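Hi W., the vanadate ion complex you wanted:
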Amino acid sequence: PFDLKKDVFVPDDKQEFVKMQQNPPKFDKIEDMAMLTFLHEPAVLYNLKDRYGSWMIYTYSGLFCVTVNPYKWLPVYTPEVVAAYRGKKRSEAPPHIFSISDNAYQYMLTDRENQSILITGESGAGKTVNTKRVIQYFAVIAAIGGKGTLEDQIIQANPALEAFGNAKTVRNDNSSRFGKFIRIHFGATGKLASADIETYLLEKSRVIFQLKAERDYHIFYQILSNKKPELLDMLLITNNPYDYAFISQGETTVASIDDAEELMATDNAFDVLGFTSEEKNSMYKLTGAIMHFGNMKFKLKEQAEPDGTEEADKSAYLMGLNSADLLKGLCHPRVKVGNEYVTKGQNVQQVIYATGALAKAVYERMFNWMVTRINATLETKQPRQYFIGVLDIAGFEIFDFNSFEQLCINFTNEKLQQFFNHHMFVLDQEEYKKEGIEWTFIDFGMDLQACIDLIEKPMGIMSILEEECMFPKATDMTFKAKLFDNHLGKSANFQKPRNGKPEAHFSLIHYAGIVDYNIIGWLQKNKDPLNETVVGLYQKSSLKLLSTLFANYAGADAPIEKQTVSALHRENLNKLMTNLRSTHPHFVRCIIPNETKSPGVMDNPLVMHQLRCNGVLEGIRICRKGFPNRILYGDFRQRYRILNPDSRKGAEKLLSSLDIDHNQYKFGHTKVFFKAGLLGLLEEMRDERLS
Ligand SMILES: Nc1ncnc2c1ncn2[C@@H]1O[C@H](COP(=O)(O)OP(=O)(O)O)[C@@H](O)[C@H]1O
Ligand code: VO4
Ligand SMILES: [Mg+2]
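Structure:
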């Protein structure tokens, strides 16, 4: 039952839009929204909602794909589905992350180009699940034709890293507290040859700090599950998380997580990856030592002195150092006086902070060590020629309390959104001019340069923070003052905080919303200083793992006569964006449907907010107004000559002699441009004549 003008979409105050002209019933649950006759905000919203209602969580929208978290297991990821999707062109199968992986694989061998699968989304949208599903597809496909084979190690690298780098947050039960770029290397002929992982900025603060509604890293609770009681024995620890201050400040148990089963999965991954018992037990020992380290009490003799060595002893053993030397490093750290040393004094406040810093440094360096070890086994020294990189960053997040870590996370999300903007809206139209195509530049209003420049550019939030660290008499309020004196009333995206709920220092108009930031401790977080007397002990440690985590350590440079976290983050992020530009990108935009992890429920305003700040509608219009398929006149002649037997003057006669809408294609300098769908008709016609 449908009428052309009686069925119309009308705006709403509670559900965004309620049942602009509606699309005919033939376009219900359409696999590509660039084929809809009417393209408007509720037409896209309702098609996604209609497909989502039938557990169709993927939908193409122009050249990229959208995906809505089902919050339930669906039978769409089986090896039957994997093997079936192999070879299938995008239009010859329903929308899926498997179809993106296979088509990126096809472009890689066809164009002899490296590919990238860039997966966007808010915290909990589904980036990590979709990333693991890309890796799954490639490994399952390569497998067709103790420590396991390359394909199994590739698969098991993610549960092993998730134990130490994932944690429960208010928005996600398995939140990635670090970004990763996985490169899957292929030979000249297309065989899977090798893989590597590059991790970016692990949330160190989480090791020793938790907000009310969140857990520390999964690993702590997995060990405390007691499913491996030999671990509790080895680590000299109890089975109660509330006995360790570093790990029990917020939540301790997650309903969706069986910590006991996960401990087995984690251990099994280290096994398949080729980790020795000395390696595994060493990592467990350090995790255990970090728990003990947090329980070390101190007191005044201002000067701190140990208040009971019981926990200090347990940590010193798992680490392999003298307990008394560890306590004297913490309390009286050495100061270099040429070839001699003088102890500095530390009050209880200072020793406590120093202990926390060393615990976060050990944990972070253990994660970086583990990644290196995974890479060393994934390095097969087999012939490689190309790669398909997959980017799984920490998603856009807004907590009841936003600190430096959230700015680093949300900044990366802004950067990745700008990458989408530049590629889809700037580079695409620039190609229409390059190929001599008739094209009026369309301003789609997709440019976050204002917010990006506010954070990364000189005299921006991060540049201000970087200089301020290099001042010994600089306080949190001098940093806030410099931030305000430079940006309030000058930077449109920098505003006064819009505040019972934790006090905020400033506001930031991010692409996905206004985030209230609190600048307390940003100066100390960016500097990241360590008690080098203890790190020196770490270098001499009798536990090979602890000695190697700190062997590369470069201390505070020697003084002469007469590097920050944010600086390294921008440096990494810029190196990432410049390298991604040399690849063919495939965008997968993940949409979190509702706040309460409810399977099948779709919050129309939350969905519409995402589709808007992502630029889904804008990205659909450019595909509809332009010519998404482009073929070189030589390659076109090679393949479609069969339809009706100079490369351009041949393609001109051939296309005019065929029975097609002659307005659906335009001629470029070196390529013939086709509109949406027309390429499929020519391939269908070639299939009719090849039989
Ligand atoms: N495609 C999917 N199918 C089923 N459940 C999913 C899917 N994507 C995400 N989920 C659910 O959402 C949770 C968080 O998704 P995740 O991929 O970790 O999000 P992100 O990486 O964007 O933070 C998962 O633990 C799972 O319960
Ligand atoms: O929850 V996330 O993995 O998006 O950080
Ligand atoms: Mg994730």
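Residues 292 and 311 are 5 Å apart (CA to CA).

W.
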